[PDB]
Amino acid sequence: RMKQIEDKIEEILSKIYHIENEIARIKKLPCMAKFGPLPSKWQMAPPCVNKVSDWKLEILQNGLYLIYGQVAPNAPFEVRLYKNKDMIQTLTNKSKIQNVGGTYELHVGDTIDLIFNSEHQVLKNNTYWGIILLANPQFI
Amino acid sequence: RMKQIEDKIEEILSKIYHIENEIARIKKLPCMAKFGPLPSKWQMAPPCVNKVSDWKLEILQNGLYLIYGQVAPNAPFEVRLYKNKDMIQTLTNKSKIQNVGGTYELHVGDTIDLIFNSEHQVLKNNTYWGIILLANPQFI
Amino acid sequence: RMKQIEDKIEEILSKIYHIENEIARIKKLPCMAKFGPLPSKWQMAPPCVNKVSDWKLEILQNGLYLIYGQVAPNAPFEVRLYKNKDMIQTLTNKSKIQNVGGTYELHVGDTIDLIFNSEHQVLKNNTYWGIILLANPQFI
């Protein structure tokens, strides 16, 4: 009868250890990435995105993303944000620092790219763009 | 004295079971909805919103929402997003695919509607809009 | 041998109490602030922001923020949103209610201010702006 009690106590300790493991994991528990400003390249925080090349990223998780950034201006001025082949934003103003992005549903395999007409039209040390995953509902 | 120990062990098991219940619930624990592209109608992920009619939704929780979507163009072109009776955005460009929405504080009872000037001006299979609840602070 | 069992049971109870404390804290666990519409002044929900003056706020945590609001129009019309000294948005339209803000990376010490050309150009009872912290990755 002592042995039973002692065997239950051993089982209880083990469950408590398991629980503290679950709690540790809960305490630890969004996906984001940013390119630039140079000299910084891709910075990230399963991944929802994969860097492709400078200024260009690939989406690895279906979902609702917010894209953000700024282009600092330094041949007509033109900076374009692309989703795959579709131009999704064009920046045209050479005087002011301009915001880039918006909220987009994106699917596995999509790419996002920020392309400069002339590389030297832009102050690469105050120009950057990033992305954050807001949600991944089943319907996307 | 054995009985006490055994009764405490029974009480402990029950508390552990309760704890694992609380953990299960924590592990399980945003509100979102999307209309379209057709043939899809309302898709959702207490609810913060209630569908009203096609393209139209009602808010059931006070809060800060982000509205998103795109209108794919196919009589002057005009698509309008409404909050109640107030037009909150107008889309006028027949060439490019255009984003819809922005961040809005919304209150219980508000409605959001996307209204097309001509139904057939739009490619309904690449046009959709959705909403996500970002936060519900007391001040809204 | 009884004493050992009893001492283990005491230790177990204490661990369970600790666990329920951790769970309580987990259950309790975004930073936001809103100014206006008047007569309301600053409303908030370590803080990520500190009010400075009416319509003006200081950032105390590095991070990615979404700024939102609306200006309800009532000398050429001009309302400007500032980040430090940089104008980041200008509102110029005296007919429609206009959205303010966008997504911005902000650093400790930055200020955000909404400045009216003429105070009485605006309906202060339907004009307000607010901010929400989306994320604080190491790279900001």
From Swiss-Prot, chains A, B, C:
Keywords recorded for this protein, A-Z: Adaptive immunity, Cell membrane, Cytokine, Disulfide bond, Glycoprotein, Immunity, Membrane, Signal-anchor, Transmembrane, Transmembrane helix
Cellular component terms per the entry's GO annotation: cell surface; extracellular space; plasma membrane
Tissues with expression: Expressed at high levels in the small intestine, ovary, testis, kidney and endothelial cells.
Keyword Magnesium on entry: no
Disulfide cross-links: 31-48
GO molecular function per UniProt: cytokine activity; identical protein binding; signaling receptor binding; tumor necrosis factor receptor superfamily binding
GO terms classed as biological process: adaptive immune response; cell-cell signaling; negative regulation of apoptotic process; negative regulation of T-helper 17 cell lineage commitment; positive regulation of cell adhesion; positive regulation of inflammatory response; positive regulation of leukocyte migration; positive regulation of macrophage chemotaxis
Topology relative to the membrane: Single-pass type II membrane protein
All copies of domain THD, residue ranges: 30-134
Topology feature Extracellular, residues: 30-140
Source superkingdom: Eukaryota
Location in the cell: Cell membrane
Regulation: induction: Up-regulated after stimulation by bacterial lipopolysaccharides (LPS).
Residues modified by glycosylation: 93, 125
Function: Cytokine that binds to TNFRSF18/AITR/GITR. Regulates T-cell responses. Can function as costimulator and lower the threshold for T-cell activation and T-cell proliferation. Important for interactions between activated T-lymphocytes and endothelial cells. Mediates activation of NF-kappa-B. Triggers increased phosphorylation of STAT1 and up-regulates expression of VCAM1 and ICAM1. Promotes leukocyte adhesion to endothelial cells. Regulates migration of monocytes from the splenic reservoir to sites of inflammation.
Family listed: Belongs to the tumor necrosis factor family.
Assembly and binders: Homodimer. Homotrimer.
Name recorded for this polypeptide: Tumor necrosis factor ligand superfamily member 18
Species this chain originates from: Homo sapiens (Human)
Section of the entire sequence shown: 57 to 176 of 177
